[PDB]
Amino acid sequence: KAEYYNAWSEWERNAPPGEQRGMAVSRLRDCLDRQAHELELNNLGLSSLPGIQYLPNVTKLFLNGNKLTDIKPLANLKNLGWLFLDENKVKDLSSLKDLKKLKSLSLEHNGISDINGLVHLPQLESLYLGNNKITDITVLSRLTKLDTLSLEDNQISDIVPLAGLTKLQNLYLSKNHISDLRALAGLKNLDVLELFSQECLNKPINHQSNLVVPNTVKNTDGSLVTPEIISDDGDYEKPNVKWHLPEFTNEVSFIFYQPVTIGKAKARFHGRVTQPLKE
């Protein structure tokens, strides 16, 4: 504990060129001294953590509203059940690998794209990944104990990794790039499902005066969703969206609004497909 108090003072003096490192050192000492289960470090602006070697009574770590980029210091908090890292800048989760009791992880607004470190947390029950940069969700197929998964406001178009996650009950997928719901067809245990605000972007094609674009928006059974609104006087004749474009234009689009039911869960699958055109 002398060595701990010491490490923490050195760290307190390395604030980069508005971090509340005094308050943090106070909280760390209070936590260690009382062998507390909770270490509350929210909104301190911290850009790093010192060495923390042995807080094995700590089961709840609150770090919302800091600016951490490296969570290697958390690696030995092996008894953590709840970890909150909202609005940090963490971009690799491999340092969590020995946290086998972790049940809840919040990591909103970190800008993370590489979530492969989740492979080490098969017992996770709640995972909050809203507002990140996630395109590749293939790790999530390992997280078969999740009850709650937020993936909203990411860059996800391939949801196949969720297809076997039948335990899922709360699933937030709004503000992604999802046009095909088939991966959700077996998720009949859902209560909450959010699928609004999709913005899907086709690869460019050449402009033609008679344009014919296959519809790519699919229900959970693979059937095509009839567009609601089509740009530029276009029409729909399944399976195609059609336009007459006597002059070049650089894009056309269409909007879809589809009630979905998966088990008991009811949601609106609602979004836009954009088709860029090359002259």
Residue numbers in the entry: 36 to 52, 55 to 87, 93 to 321
Please share text taken word for word from the publication where this structure appeared.
InlB is a surface-associated or secreted protein that mediates uptake of the pathogen Listeria monocytogenes into normally non-phagocytic cells by specifically stimulating the receptor tyrosine kinase MET on host cells. InlB consists of an internalin domain, a B-repeat and three GW domains. The internalin domain can be subdivided into an N-terminal helical cap domain, a leucine-rich repeat domain and an immunoglobulin-like inter-repeat (IR) domain. Using this approach the biochemical properties of the cap + LRR fragment, the IR domain, the B-repeat, the GW1 module and the GW2 + GW3 pair were addressed. These experiments showed that a cap + LRR fragment is sufficient for MET binding, but that the IR domain also contacts the receptor and contributes to MET activation.
To address a potential interaction of the InlB cap domain with a binding partner from the host cell, we sought to replace the cap by a structurally unrelated domain that still initiates folding. The hybrid protein combines residues 34–87 of YopM with residues 93–321 of InlB and will be referred to as YopM-InlB. The structure of YopM-InlB at 1.5 Å resolution confirms that this designed chimeric protein is properly folded. With a melting temperature (TM) of 49,9°C (+/−0.22°C) YopM-InlB was destabilized by about 2 K with respect to InlB321 containing the native N-terminal cap (TM of 51,9°C (+/− 0.21°C)). There are major shifts between wild type InlB and the hybrid protein in residues on the concave face of LRR1. The side chains of InlB Gln80 and Asn84 form hydrogen bonds to Thr646 and His644 of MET, respectively, in the crystal structure of the InlB:MET complex. Due to their relative shift, the equivalent atoms in the corresponding residues in YopM-InlB would no longer be able to form these hydrogen bonds. Instead rearrangements extend to LRR2 and to a lesser extent to LRR3. We had not anticipated this medium range effect, which can in retrospect be explained by a slightly lower curvature in the N-terminal region of the protein due to the absence of a 310 helix in the first LRR of YopM. The reduced affinity of YopM-InlB for MET is presumably due to the exchange of the first LRR along with the cap domain resulting in spatial shifts of residues from LRR1, LRR2, and LRR3, whose side chains are involved in MET binding.
